[PDB]
Structures are given as C-alpha cells and as structure tokens.
C-alpha cells in the first residue's frame, strides 16, 4: 500500500539541523521540478531518483514532504515492506498502480520508505524465496528507466541500511544521488528543539541550549517526543506552562527507553 497526501503541509523552516542536505535536495529535486525547461537549456541532467540514508526518525520523510509542499506536488508515501507480497506478480502489480497514480496526480514525489525491503542484494543464486521480490524490484526499475524524462514526477528512496542495497539500483539513470541524513549534532538538536517548542508555552527557566547538550545522539523524532512528554509532565502537575524540570524528566525517560540493550 501507499499513503497519498495531495498537498502535504511541511515547510523547510520546520526541519531543523540539516542545512546542507536540505539545500542539496532543494537544488537536486525541487529546482528541476520547478524549472525543467531551464535544466534543459542550461545543459545538466537532473536525477530521476535520489536515495536518502541514515537512522529512522531523522527527517527523511520530512524533507520529501517539504519538497512536495514547496512544489504543490502530490505526496506519495510507499511502505517498502508492504510491497513484499508472497504471490506471483503481486509486488510488481502495486508498483504499477503507484506510478499510474503518480502520473495521474502529477506533479508528485514518490517517497519509498525502506526500499531495502525490495532492493536488498540477497546472497546469491539460491534465490527461491526472494525471487518474487526480484520480480518487483525489476518492475520499479522499468517504471524508472521508463516514463522518466526531466521532472514531472520525482522519486526519493530511503533506507537506514544502505550497504545491503543492490548496486544495480545505484547505477546512473536511477538513484544516483545518495544523501546521508544523520542523527543531528548539538547545534542541530537545538534547532529541532526550537521548532517543536515553537507553539508551546515555555517557562522562563527553560534553557533549550542545555537540553540539546543533554541529548547525545537522539534523533528528531525522539526530540519531538521529549517536547510532548515534557508538556505532559506539566499537565500531570496541572500546570499551564512547561518547566526546565519537566524536560529533565522527559529527557531522562526517553534516554532510558533508548537504552534498550
Ligand atoms: N530534523 C528534524 N527536524 C524536525 N523534525 C524532525 C526531524 N527529525 C524528525 N523529526 C520529527 O519526527 C517525525 C519523524 O520524521 P520522519 O521524517 O518521518 O523520519 P524519517 O527520517 O525516519 O523519515 C517528523 O514528523 C518530525 O516531527
């Protein structure tokens, strides 16, 4: 299955701590989408597909939505694993309907979450089981090498497991840009903290700088959760405003939850 969102609502001012990878996408998919005739006359060939790596909850989906919003393209999220049907032609079939729908509601960004589900290189020619998943993988590449000219429909792939990937896919004329989207540094965390606390009622004791410092290697999704946990501590103590203290308890909770070793 695929989840469709015609006009997503994600703006770049809301994606923290990815200044460079944000710019790279902007110019490597947004710009081509906006100005195909320009890319044409200037000379350079834009990517048909771009691939995003790194941990889960880092903002990969986010960026894609963000591009989809800045371009009023139909956002199309494809759940990688959900394409692993164990029946003849069933996987490939869904890929077809997905491109059918991407063109029908073009412009559109197809963001495929976890393509390593489909595009993992197996182990060898004792394929059996994942011979069918190969039938699907081939279907995708067909659609790609296929319809694609410049930019009316763009494809973004995402994985947190890039060396499992099949070189076949990384070939030019497919996913040839591969951007890392990493857990953010300290500087990064703070921006993300500023974004998610932007609509909440913070007490004047709340040193955000401090909490960014407290959250070694959390991801944007985990930080988002911290903000909504801190608020709930306030609610729990029937308040109206969120305290430096609340956050220390949120951080503390989420960091242990993270230590699932
Ligand atoms: N860099 C970030 N900036 C702002 N919000 C983020 C960031 N990373 C994660 N989030 C929050 O967590 C959610 C999950 O991000 P998403 O892009 O879906 O994760 P993934 O990188 O796995 O695609 C986002 O909707 C956003 O609210």
Curated annotation (Swiss-Prot):
Q: Which domain of life is it from?
A: Archaea
The GO cellular component terms are: cytoplasm; proteasome regulatory particle, base subcomplex; proteasome-activating nucleotidase complex
Q: What is the effect of changing residue 87 to A?
A: 1% of wild-type unfolding activity
Subcellular localization: Cytoplasm
Q: According to the UniProt entry, how is activity regulated?
A: ATPase activity is inhibited by EDTA, N-ethylmaleimide (NEM) and p-chloromercuriphenyl-sulfonic acid (PCMS) in vitro.
Please give the UniProt note on temperature dependence for this protein. Optimum temperature is 80 degrees Celsius for ATPase activity.
Q: Cite a single GO BP annotation.
A: proteasome-mediated ubiquitin-dependent protein catabolic process
Effect noted on mutating residue 128 to W: 1.6% of wild-type unfolding activity
Q: Which GO terms describe its molecular function?
A: ATP binding; ATP hydrolysis activity; CTPase activity; GTPase activity; proteasome-activating activity
Family as reported in the entry's similarity comment: Belongs to the AAA ATPase family.
Protein purpose: ATPase which is responsible for recognizing, binding, unfolding and translocation of substrate proteins into the archaeal 20S proteasome core particle. Is essential for opening the gate of the 20S proteasome via an interaction with its C-terminus, thereby allowing substrate entry and access to the site of proteolysis. Thus, the C-termini of the proteasomal ATPase function like a 'key in a lock' to induce gate opening and therefore regulate proteolysis.
| Comment field on protein domains | Consists of three main regions, an N-terminal coiled-coil domain that may assist in substrate recognition, an interdomain involved in PAN hexamerization, and a C-terminal ATPase domain of the AAA type.
The name under which this protein is listed is Proteasome-activating nucleotidase
**Which classification does the entry list for the species?**
Archaea, Methanobacteriati, Methanobacteriota, Methanomada group, Methanococci
Q: Gene of origin?
A: pan
Q: What part of the full protein is here?
A: 158 to 418 of 430
